[PDB]
Design a binder for this molecule. Structure first.
Ligand SMILES: Nc1ncnc2c1ncn2[C@@H]1O[C@H](COP(=O)(O)OP(=O)(O)OP(=O)(O)O)[C@@H](O)[C@H]1O
Ligand SMILES: Nc1ncnc2c1ncn2[C@@H]1O[C@H](COP(=O)(O)OP(=O)(O)OP(=O)(O)O)[C@@H](O)[C@H]1O
Ligand SMILES: Nc1ncnc2c1ncn2[C@@H]1O[C@H](COP(=O)(O)OP(=O)(O)OP(=O)(O)O)[C@@H](O)[C@H]1O
Ligand SMILES: [K+]
Ligand SMILES: [K+]
Ligand SMILES: [K+]
Ligand SMILES: [Mg+2]
Ligand SMILES: [Mg+2]
Ligand SMILES: [Mg+2]
Lengths: 524, 524, 524
């Protein structure tokens, strides 16, 4: 299509206009006294949210140039969210400050590229300063605090994530779903448990419900399917010579073998249950090995010379109790020694260097949690669907925030961190005057979060800013109680990772964005 | 469709106007104090770039005639990019100048054709003068400098390309992709390395991680599948008489074969590994020939008289050491003679210089880089996707600029080269006055790059130009430090190839373009 | 659709207007001081050309009637190009002159049909007169000159096609393609070359690229395909006793025989190559006989009593050198005596004197050209694609022009020839006054070319016309050097064929066009 082209001040003003539309559209959700946004959707009912990224994503402008600007600044929120999962609004505001002040510096006639350079320098130094200021977050109290703040000061979330991480372990895997009831409910699975229930409902035990429990059970593992039942002679007879109940694991077992199983179990000669393999292809075997080590038995595999026939009482695994229900399989206690299990945890460390980032991390934490650890599922309660969506979003985000807080530590919230590191980099300089101006632009922009929060609280931002800048250390302004004090002692802490990320991303996009001298877009 | 037609000055003015829209759209991106351009995209987010070609490709006008002009001059930047990969803007500016003064001369009533002739002669002579002026750049310092300048004065890129070219070789193959982290990372793989790791991790060697190393290994390769292993009697038994370890390569190997193999390695009679085929269909074979020749053995194929049974140790390949892990396989040094690998690099150089033009180059260069000349892969680091695209693009262009610099040498940047060869061609004449005017058009137009740079720096161009012409040799104006001096000592070098290419292309298209007397297009 | 109809002076004026649009659009490209035209293209970048036909083809008008006229006059340029390949503008201008002067005569109230009659007669006499004035063009100099003039006075092209025809032969085949490099490059293939490359790329020789050359090669030729390979005992045995390499030509060769063949070449016991039959049905056999005659061997044929098995070294052919590549097969020197070729060429001469006169003439002449008359491929060098297109086009046209010059001879350029034959037909009369007006219309129109060229040079056309008519013989006006003189001695030569063609076509189409009294077209 024929293109519309614009140059210089015209284009820059246009862009800035679009950017500011997006920014103003996002900013209303910042701070403890922030406000929500409703997004219409072509299909169903609209969405209410406080999460900046969503509103940014929904934003699109009619004026092609304004559209361009907004569509470029959206990447701030998007990348921020994709990276850490919180503080996206902060990032956006930073971006706006850098872009505005930057363009102002360009209007003085200064070299844009050098401005970008200065900004980049300042931001790098700031990142190092943050990495230094970062304080480790280990106690359940602090974690509760981060979770609370990331959920917009809702301590329910704090205590919830607290109980979760406390029970599973500080690194263990936690997931969250839409709840059934109105109140938040936490489900926790301890020890070895996985999907796929029993095959034949014909099996029953001492309790009801169809779930089968076994006393001092024996475990077998196989790679292939089975069809013959006479072929199970060397094993079954042995078990028939022991009297002890048996458990079998493979991808499947056909109707006739299961029939034999049901008949022999019903006549009461031996109690046996059968359950399909957990995963697919390589993964199911990779898990079968660890299950074997946990039980104490040895894996049998058709892909190796060892056949289904050759089966010994040492190849069989051992446990104290096993329970299998309709959908899930559960092992209570494997006789595998603590040294063996610990060694398994050792060998697991090798499996980390194959990311495949969060997919490898999720599968790895999944298989690891089936050891001494555990799995936590948070079911978020709400009255109506909108409440459900927003609440779940906030809870997820809170989880990500606590995770990042554990990973890279925390710094004093209320955006006082940026003020502190700027005030520390006050003496930072560049290779020439314009670059110095760039440095000053970045630093000046670093005050933006706090003052924006204060603006959203209906209080004079310049004043609060200056009064906070006048202080030292973790001195900051608590917006909820409208009083100054030590932010950490008041429990307002932002994960270092999210702040660092915000600053970096915003600095990148804005730094490039202020280097525009020409724009080409489609003609209307 | 019914056509609109225009003659003479009307058409020419229209054309010039279109050309000038494109030209101005490109021109803003020239020089160290140059500025960037934003291109809207029909699909996703907009693009920031400094690449003249990109903006040129994106340009299209509403007035059919202006459009004709612009769409004709875009080919300059395009052909320039396809040829050298840098200096496209320079070519564009040259074209604009030539077109303007040319059209002025035509409006003076001079014969356009003779103008073309004069321009062409002047340009040829200029090219000869440049190839004469060309100064070779072999050393790491200078290469670092040209790579640096092509990357808009970013010495990170220069030093990076330097380390690359140093490790792989000045002619060896280098590739570059978008990185994962924020900082640039360089990986270099020496010898033979490619995808597809082992299938069964059950067999292992001295190291951990599952990776297996072999001592003076023997290599096998097959085109089709297999099922029997007893049919491999004549080879395996022979190896059992040799003791040397074996490797197998095919599309895959079946379960029972894997069983026999794993058992045989576990019992410790012979250590052997098997890996799936690298490519697909013809490609995997085309590479299999190369691996066979590198090892020294001969390819076995079912489509030829040689069967799966018939296998000897002369067709079988040999190497000194091989390491294979989960996903990739690596051979360091094949015992295949240097004559074999050399003959093969010859043959591959032959097979690339035929296939055309774009689709083939990636797979073919992939096949080329896998020999004794290692392959270096540069991972470009960036904060956000936009920065990634622009930085990566600039890096590729810079790589091309350095390669072209190696191929044809360098001359003093700042476009002073053109000024100098112009000052040298002062006594050049033609067969008549009009051709002299053409020559003069070329010569005067050759000042355009430098003066344009100075103009972009916000300095008076005529003055700087005259002060540079007043000097001699590599005397030029460094715009970054805003000071005159020896361009070479300042590290401002333009590859001769890019300069020559620019001038020639611009000369062709403009030379033709100024001979227009009629234009025909569709009706609006 | 409902029709718009127009009569008499209205219609004629409309028609004339359209005609003049096309005419004015074309005339600008006439002469050495001619100018170019730009044609927009729906897909990619526009085309620059001097070729009248292209411009004529692109023209189309909105007014249905004007459109009608132009669309009728396009046929002149089209047929002219299909016939000779040059002089199309000349034809067009003649057409315009005839149409205008004619329409004036019709508006005088004279009988249009009689005008047609007169024009036709005058033109007939003129063509005969041209046949008389026609001077043979045999020497390399004259040919070069014609090539130069047809290439818009560029002696590079003249000398190039001259060298082409000189190396290849006055009867041999010459082709032209887009070059790879920047300079014009001539490739010449000596001795028999045709389609169909190798079958299996598996076999290779001393050179690379996959193309195989043979040393003092031996050739066999067959009519049918094969499936068995052992039955070729009498052949293979011979080569197995001789060691000399073999070449085979047949309809095809199946998979297993080709497999044995390639394996046979790989083990290195016998060097052999295989290539598909040249033509189809009658042509493949008819030429296979010729290959047999040139090599010295005898054709083997299944359709004749001699079997594939019974084959002796007397039936088998021999050659000096053979090179066969991916698509083409080439034999350098057949051992067949010089006398042998002549007799076959004789029989072909007998096959020429038959009915079917077109397609057969082409097949027969190619087949005749397949002997000592070498093949030339001209690779046209240029910097960019537009230059490439225009230059290649001009080169083809020049080639056709020289071919025609050789075929039917040459006459003095500058359009002085037409003036001469007009002045000769001054005393020509018809059957009535209106027809006299017709012949006079033709004659007056015949001055148009010269007058138009001078008009394009910007000098008074009437004066130069009169000064040239005032002279005698080949005295004419050279526009390039702006001086009068003997045109033949000045190297301005026009093929008689192209001029004759121009006059004839224009006379036909215009002659018909001026007899219009009604026009019927669609309603807008
Ligand atoms: N009670 C409080 N007093 C002072 N500052 C607070 C308080 N609660 C939160 N903040 C500050 O507000 C910021 C969080 O704002 P908000 O939760 O509205 O958006 P965000 O988390 O920055 O981004 P996202 O849109 O991803 O949620 C934090 O940086 C925090 O320091
Ligand atoms: N610091 C400097 N001082 C003087 N001249 C410079 C400096 N940096 C670059 N140049 C000149 O600028 C030119 C390169 O400009 P730039 O990299 O902006 O675009 P380009 O490479 O010409 O075109 P493109 O990159 O779009 O293909 C070089 O010819 C070089 O001589
Ligand atoms: N230097 C010259 N002096 C005089 N007449 C010339 C000269 N050059 C060419 N001509 C005349 O111009 C005619 C050819 O013109 P031109 O090559 O411009 O177009 P064309 O061949 O008529 O048609 P086309 O556009 O198809 O090439 C020839 O008949 C020749 O006599
Ligand atoms: K928020
Ligand atoms: K550039
Ligand atoms: K022409
Ligand atoms: Mg939040
Ligand atoms: Mg550059
Ligand atoms: Mg011509």
């Amino acid at each position: 299509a024929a293109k519309d082209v614009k140059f210089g001040n015209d284009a820059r003003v246009k862009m800035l206009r679009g950017v500011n539309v997006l920014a103003d559209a996002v900013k209303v959700t910042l701070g403890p006294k922030g406000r929500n946004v409703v997004l219409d959707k072509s299909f169903g009912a609209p969405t209410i949210t406080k999460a900046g990224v969503s509103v940014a994503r929904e934003i699109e402008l009619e004026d092609k140039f304004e559209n361009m600007g907004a569509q470029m600044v959206k990447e701030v929120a998007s990348k921020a969210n994709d990276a850490a999962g919180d503080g996206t609004t902060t990032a956006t505001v930073l971006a706006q400050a850098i872009i505005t002040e930057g363009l102002k510096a360009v209007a003085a006639g200064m070299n844009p590229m050098d401005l970008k350079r200065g900004i980049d320098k300042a931001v790098t130094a700031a990142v190092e300063e943050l990495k230094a200021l970062s304080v480790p977050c280990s106690d359940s109290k602090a974690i509760a605090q981060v979770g609370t703040i990331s959920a917009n000061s809702d301590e329910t979330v704090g205590k919830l994530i607290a109980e979760a991480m406390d029970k599973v372990g500080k690194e263990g895997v936690i997931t969250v779903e839409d709840g059934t009831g109105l109140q938040d409910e936490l489900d926790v699975v301890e020890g070895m448990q996985f999907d796929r229930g029993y095959l034949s409902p014909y099996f029953i035990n001492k309790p009801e419900t169809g779930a089968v429990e076994l006393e001092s059970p024996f475990i077998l593992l196989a790679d292939k399917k089975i069809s013959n039942i006479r072929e199970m002679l060397p094993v079954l007879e042995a078990v028939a010579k022991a009297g002890k109940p048996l458990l079998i694991i493979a991808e499947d077992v056909e109707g006739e073998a299961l029939a034999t199983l049901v008949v022999n179990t019903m006549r009461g000669i031996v109690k046996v249950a059968a359950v399909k393999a957990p995963g697919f292809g390589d993964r199911r075997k990779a898990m079968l090995q660890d299950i074997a080590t946990l039980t104490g038995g040895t894996v049998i595999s058709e892909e190796i010379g060892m056949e289904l026939e050759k089966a010994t009482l040492e190849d069989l695994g051992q446990a104290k109790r096993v329970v299998i229900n309709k959908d899930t399989t559960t092992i209570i206690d494997g006789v595998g020694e603590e040294a063996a299990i610990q060694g398994r945890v050792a060998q697991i460390r090798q499996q980390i260097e194959e990311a495949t980032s969060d997919y490898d991390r999720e599968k790895l934490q999944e298989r690891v949690a089936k050891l001494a650890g555990g799995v936590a599922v948070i079911k978020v309660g709400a009255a109506t669907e909108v409440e459900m969506k927003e609440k779940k979003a906030r809870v997820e985000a809170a989880l990500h925030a606590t995770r990042a807080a554990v990973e890279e530590g925390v710094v004093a919230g209320g955006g006082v961190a940026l003020i502190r590191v700027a005030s520390k980099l006050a003496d930072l300089r560049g290779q020439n005057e314009d670059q110095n101006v760039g440095i000053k632009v970045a630093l000046r922009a670093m005050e933006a979060p706090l003052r924006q929060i204060v603006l959203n609280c209906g209080e004079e931002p310049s004043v609060v800013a200056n009064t906070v800048k006048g202080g030292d250390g973790n001195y900051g302004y608590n917006a909820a109680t409208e009083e100054y004090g030590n932010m950490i002692d008041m429990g307002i802490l932002d994960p270092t990772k999210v702040t660092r990320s915000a600053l970096q991303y915003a600095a990148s996009v804005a730094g490039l964005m202020i280097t525009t001298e020409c724009m080409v877009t489609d003609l209307p």
